[PDB]
Amino acid sequence: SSPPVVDTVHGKVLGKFVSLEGFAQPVAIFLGIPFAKPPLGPLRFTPPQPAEPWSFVKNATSYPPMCTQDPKAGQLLSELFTNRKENIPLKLSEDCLYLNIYTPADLTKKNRLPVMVWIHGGGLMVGAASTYDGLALAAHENVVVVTIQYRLGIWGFFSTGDEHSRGNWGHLDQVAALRWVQDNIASFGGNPGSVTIFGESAGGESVSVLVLSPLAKNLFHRAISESGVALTSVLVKKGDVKPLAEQIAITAGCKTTTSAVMVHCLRQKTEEELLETTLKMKFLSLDLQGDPRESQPLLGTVIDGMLLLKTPEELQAERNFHTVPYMVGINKQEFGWLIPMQLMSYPLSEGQLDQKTAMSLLWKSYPLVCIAKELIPEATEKYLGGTDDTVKKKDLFLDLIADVMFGVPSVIVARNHRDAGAPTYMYEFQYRPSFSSDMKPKTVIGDHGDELFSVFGAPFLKEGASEEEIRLSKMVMKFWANFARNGNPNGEGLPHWPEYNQKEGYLQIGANTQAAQKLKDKEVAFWTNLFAK
Ligand SMILES: *[C@@](O)(c1ccccc1Cl)C(F)(F)F
């Protein structure tokens, strides 16, 4: 019964025990541990500072707020992605730099378990750590699971393109959480010499950015990007970021006289005024009015000169990144339902698409796929021209967006990582979880986020999982935690997962799981040639 109490650098923390049926050792859970000073007032749009130390024992048994964000979209994504039986309602706050810890170690003995640090998705605009319950993965695989938060949206990524607001505050928060883990996780039974970062969607892009950042040197030892990398271009702003900053300033009621003037004005706004600004900007929603080249669907990663010194393409060309073991994976249908239908309000209710509407829509999709207008016909013809059925054309259009956004970027990242001599692994995930939304057509399989339910052991926390689904989660969890332990997912009882080498082996994960070769090879060739003009 007696709750666990752990000493950290900054003070003592009190957690709680939670048992998972069939595991003798209850899991010690610590909710809402601060890893930075709350980024309020003048600390807005600045790097995170260390948390101030506290006397006595901090009660770490309540979920922290989630970072300020569109509450409706944030709650929706939490409901769609959570592995728990009931979604936990969360408060909003700028005071959100917290992490949650699930340790299966008996804290009365000494333990050095591998640590897995989860970075949540959400487009860099929404999301929360508390969505993801670490209980099942921690108990089933004997790993310490850490879920982190980081500033989002305007708070996390507002950039003037210069020294007055460089940008990438949320990525700096991720780095601060990893340094906290280095300094403290051994008190929770974890091994700071074996930290694996893993994340999905914008969280997978964050993992890829951290692989590219000198600030993350020696903070992690393996990495996993699930459905998102630093070549997912909608998340990485190149070129001139000043137009977006000025539009944000104006919407908030601020002058644009200079960068410093904009940033100081935004620093005086209340949280509520910046949230009103966020909602007026209509982020994460396909912009159908005006020139598509001016659409800004999210505030994201920039080349700031501190976290990222050059573009991801330039960094991989010079082999300037952390050559840790790296697992890069995609799902069979990344654009099948949840991103267009639930997050971005795509005009695809009809379920048939003719080629003319497809070209018009692909042009409107410019902020996602970056295809010049003169190249829209060729691109569309390559995917939709081979059939005459317009339902098939709609499905092939979804394939096209998925390949440009996720599949091709992921293979290019994996190839460049392999070519720097690092151990590299890839997967393609194909399963339709029973936990899918009731709104989701039964023909969508391997949608964006579908692997989450297997990675986080949803069949052991939510009800109604089939026996096949339970088996799948046990295998995925074991692959992931073997990778955390050894930088190699393989082990006894598991299908062989080849290294992604020059033969380009990868694992097809699903009801039938087996190795395959050359993922997306034809598509990479096509799109690389197309984007070279
Ligand atoms: C992902 O973070 C996401 C959302 C929108 C665009 C791109 C990406 Cl990677 C989410 F939200 F989980 F789907």
Residue numbers in the entry: 4 to 536
Please give the exact wording used by the authors of the publication that reports this structure.
Human carboxylesterase 1A (hCES1A) was employed as a target enzyme for inhibitory activity (IC50) screening due to its conservative catalytic serine residue. By the analysis of X-ray crystal structure, human CES1A has a serine esterase catalytic triad (Ser-221, His-468, and Glu-354), such catalytic triad is conserved in all mammalian species.. Herein, the halogen effects on the reactivity of the halogenated 2,2,2-trifluoroacetophenones as serine-targeting covalent warheads were investigated. Our results showed that introducing halogen atoms, especially Cl or Br, into the phenyl scaffold would influence the electron density around the ring, which led to different time-dependent inhibition response to the target serine hydrolase (hCES1A).
Surprisingly, dichloro-substituted analogues F-4 deriving from analogues F-1 and F-2 exhibited more promising contribution than monosubstituted analogues, but introducing three chloride atoms into the ring was not tolerated perhaps due to their enhanced passivation effect. The covalent interactions were evaluated by nano LC-MS/MS, which offered powerful evidence to support the formation of the covalent adducts and well-explained the time-dependent inhibition of these covalent fragments. Chloro-species compounds F-3 and F-4 were chosen to detect their covalent binding sites on hCES1A. Since the activity of electrophilic warheads and the formation of covalent adducts are related to temperature, we set the incubation conditions at two different temperature points (4 °C and 25°C, respectively). This analysis certainly found several allosteric binding sites, although no expected result of any compound covalently binding to Ser221 at the catalytic cavity of hCES1A. Successfully, the co-crystallography of hCES1A with F-3 and F-4 provided promising covalent binding modes at the catalytic triad. It could be obviously seen that the carbonyl group of F-4 was attacked by the oxygen of the OH group of Ser221, forming an expected hemiacetal covalent bond. The OH of the hemiacetal group introduced multiple hydrogen interactions with Gly143, Gly142 and Ala222 nearby, stabilising the formed hemiacetal adduct and favouring binding of the compound at this site. Notably, the co-crystallisation of the parent compound F and hCES1A failed to result in similar covalent interactions. This further proves that the halogen effect may promote the formation of covalent adducts by changing the sensitivity of the electrophilic warhead. The introduction of halogen atoms, particularly chlorine, into the phenyl scaffold enhances the benzocarbonyl reactivity in forming hemiacetal adducts with serine.
